[PDB]
Design a protein around this nucleic acid. Sequence first.
RNA 1: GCGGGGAAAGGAAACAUCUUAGUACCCGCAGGAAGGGAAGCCAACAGGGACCCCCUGAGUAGGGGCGACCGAAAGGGGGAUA
RNA 2: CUCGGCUUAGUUUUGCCGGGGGAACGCGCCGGCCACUGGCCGGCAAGGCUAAGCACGUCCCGAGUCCGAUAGCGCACUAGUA
RNA 3: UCGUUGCGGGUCCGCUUACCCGCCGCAAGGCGGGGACAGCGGCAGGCGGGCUGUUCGGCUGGGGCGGCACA
RNA 4: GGCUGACUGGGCCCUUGAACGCAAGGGGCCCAGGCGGGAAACCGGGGCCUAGAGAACGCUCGUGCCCCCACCAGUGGGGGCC
Lengths: 152, 184, 91, 155
Amino acid sequence: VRRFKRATKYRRGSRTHGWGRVGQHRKSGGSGGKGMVGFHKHKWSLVMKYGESGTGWPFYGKHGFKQPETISVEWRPINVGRLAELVKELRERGEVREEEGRLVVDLLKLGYNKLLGGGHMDVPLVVYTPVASKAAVEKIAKAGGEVRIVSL
Amino acid sequence: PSAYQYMAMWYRKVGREVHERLMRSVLIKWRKEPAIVRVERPFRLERARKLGYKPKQGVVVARVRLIRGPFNRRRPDSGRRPKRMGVYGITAWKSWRQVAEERAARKFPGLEVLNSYWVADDGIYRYFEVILIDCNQPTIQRDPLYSGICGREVPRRRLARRLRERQRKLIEHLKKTLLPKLKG
Amino acid sequence: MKFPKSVNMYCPRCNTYTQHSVSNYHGGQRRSLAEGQRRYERKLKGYGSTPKPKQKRFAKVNKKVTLVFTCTKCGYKIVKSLGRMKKVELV
Amino acid sequence: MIPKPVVQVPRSIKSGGVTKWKEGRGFSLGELKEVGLNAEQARLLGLPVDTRRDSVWPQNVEALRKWLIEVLEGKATPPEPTLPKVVKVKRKRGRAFRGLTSAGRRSRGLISTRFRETHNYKFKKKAKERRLKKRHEATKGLGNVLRISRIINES
RNA sequence: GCGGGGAAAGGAAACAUCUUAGUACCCGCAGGAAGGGAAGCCAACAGGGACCCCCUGAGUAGGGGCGACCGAAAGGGGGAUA
RNA sequence: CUCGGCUUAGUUUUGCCGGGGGAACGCGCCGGCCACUGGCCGGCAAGGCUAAGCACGUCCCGAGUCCGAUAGCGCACUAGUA
RNA sequence: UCGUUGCGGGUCCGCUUACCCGCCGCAAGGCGGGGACAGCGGCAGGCGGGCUGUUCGGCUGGGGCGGCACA
RNA sequence: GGCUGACUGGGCCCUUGAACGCAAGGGGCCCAGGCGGGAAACCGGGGCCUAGAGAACGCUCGUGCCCCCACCAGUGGGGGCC
Ligand SMILES: [Mg+2]
Ligand SMILES: [Mg+2]
Ligand SMILES: [Mg+2]
Ligand SMILES: [Mg+2]
Ligand SMILES: [Mg+2]
Ligand SMILES: [Mg+2]
Ligand SMILES: [Mg+2]
Ligand SMILES: [Mg+2]
Ligand SMILES: [Mg+2]
Ligand SMILES: [Mg+2]
Ligand SMILES: [Mg+2]
Ligand SMILES: [Mg+2]
Ligand SMILES: [Mg+2]
Ligand SMILES: [Mg+2]
Ligand SMILES: [Mg+2]
Ligand SMILES: [Mg+2]
Ligand SMILES: [Mg+2]
Ligand SMILES: [Mg+2]
Ligand SMILES: [Mg+2]
Ligand SMILES: [Mg+2]
Ligand SMILES: [Mg+2]
Ligand SMILES: [Mg+2]
Ligand SMILES: [Mg+2]
Ligand SMILES: [Mg+2]
Ligand SMILES: [Mg+2]
Ligand SMILES: [Mg+2]
Ligand SMILES: [Zn+2]
């Protein structure tokens, strides 16, 4: 932790406090209005810098619809490579039941509900997951494991 | 079917035409009586009993007549933005039934309004009957429904002592009739 | 300007050139169930000033000429603009 | 140590199958029936009873059987019964004037919807937040400041 | 604390919808607290289980000259428990 | 149900008030984000009460990186006084 | 226009008891006139500076008029 | 004389906007589809070149064996992307 002197300490004896002599420190006119205003008239050049040309889209307008969140699954996927790390830790503590001669993990008790295919699987694994991507099923099956799709 | 079920027929479709003939004469008298009048018996007996009326000493049934329609919204007489200048169609968040109960309560100071119900309509007026109870009357005070309005106190030493005794006797009974089954 | 009533035009659906009948574009009727119309009628209720802007000064002399080209083989419709000029005469 | 009922957290569609447990309001009548009690007897023993709940969980039944044996053998002391111990009804004055009659309750919205969704509740809730500057009322226009700042910093 | 009546200034760099704000203020009515409270509930085929208040959900859904700006609820954790 | 209006995040979908129309009955009725139909699920409105846990500060007690007689409450005093 | 709005006879006629207007009466009620009209409430169209809120742009050899050297 | 390229789906660059941020509009070079003229080369995404040019919200039309509408399925209706 480092501590620094407040700017007011430096500004004593400076008449203007960093606001200049010409364009001094005034009220909301010095901001071009109160709040997030002006973006279509005098701050339109700020919209053109950051937003879509022609439409100024993110600043103004509508695009698409929202699928209602109360009827949409909130996904918590895990990659195959990250899963391989997880089972290694789980095995050391003894949380893995090697039920069938192979390590058995089920994603839902681990807090995940989908399996993705990034990374590498280095052990044969039985994975109980509601959803698994195409490469996840292949990579798990290439290591001697298997994906089992449960029904929500 | 109680007689009260049959009494309700005059405010249903089967009896409306006969009831509506009767009210055309009755309302002539009610338009000339005082705006708030105490009546011996409720006009809709089955409805009054559902709302807590009983013919005990200290139960007051009052008939209230008031002018229907929207409340007397005033046109503002100083500067307003246009949204705040309208008059027609603007009503109160109070119903006329609540207004009737409040006016009845002013005529019977110290009494508590229990409930009210609609009786009749005419072109200008609406008629309600309001049930009021005197919380100072011994008959009223001990009534199981009216005590909720008039107040009720049971000492903690009474309920707690009774509950502690019941718990102690239950444990002894369950020792004989339940402990073997639990351990079996 | 005069314009033909029938032209030979590329049809994207047929993936070939076919004869197309030509007609003026006519805007459809605003339907009261359109979401913007539902919102407007809601906004129009109650007291207040007129709630929305309404243009008073107009500057265009002519509108853009819009023509509907209907494929005579499959019915595919291409609506194209010929630019801002006076109404064409379909010949 | 009087057991606490264990119930399942309702599994939403949003959860995607992940489930968890929580402490329930009370033991269900089905669970009490398996240990030979009704709602009244269980309440006299100090147990929380939930007659609304339909589920029967074996872990709840097992906890009840273990604790009942301790109580019936004199090893555990039941707490006070889970029944009212005081009766405190105050005399009411001006029910009609404060909107507490049925007509007032209707106009306040309490017949058609929950207390939390009535308009007077919304007025009072927001007034408190603004008075204390709590949560989102510490900054007026917070949503628009966030929205514009996200566009600029995520462009 | 409960019910009702109910603005404008200012903001939107003008201004009327809007906001400010169901605020200021006015009228009525209570208590040592008030109001709320015991499923014509919520959920989604898995289950919660009266109510109020605190933390969160969340400035999310949604409302809005779709502008300024406004803004939940269910669920989860607690206080307390009838 | 319909029309007008206030309100609400409530949006073809919040609550209510007013004008007009207006049910059924447990073999019934109500809810499941536009309406209707079928299925499934959840319930029983239009009557009343209810402790605890939550707001406040005339008042009492304690505390203080607060002020120290132009400060700090308008008032350290024969101050809401002259 | 919806309601108040009822009763007889073939949209029309009549009636009075609603409702309205006046007289008498402390009140009760009586008398006369009008009469399902009018009046009153809701909804809808018109007239509506009577009243409320606002807008009445810019450049400019000062402003104004002009012009558009405003795209 | 023969035609409709004033074409469908896209990309890159120049200018508007000097070096130096920044709309719409306009122009140029191409790739793919399918054409017109021509023996062929080649040319045609309007006019020999430099002017005739319009955001958000809203509406409307075209397009798709198109996506969504709150427990599930269906009908009407609504919304969405281009
Ligand atoms: Mg400056
Ligand atoms: Mg300057
Ligand atoms: Mg200065
Ligand atoms: Mg602009
Ligand atoms: Mg849209
Ligand atoms: Mg103003
Ligand atoms: Mg806010
Ligand atoms: Mg201020
Ligand atoms: Mg302003
Ligand atoms: Mg001004
Ligand atoms: Mg209390
Ligand atoms: Mg209370
Ligand atoms: Mg608000
Ligand atoms: Mg019932
Ligand atoms: Mg002093
Ligand atoms: Mg000194
Ligand atoms: Mg008339
Ligand atoms: Mg009239
Ligand atoms: Mg004027
Ligand atoms: Mg102007
Ligand atoms: Mg000037
Ligand atoms: Mg001039
Ligand atoms: Mg330019
Ligand atoms: Mg430059
Ligand atoms: Mg140009
Ligand atoms: Mg749902
Ligand atoms: Zn075709």
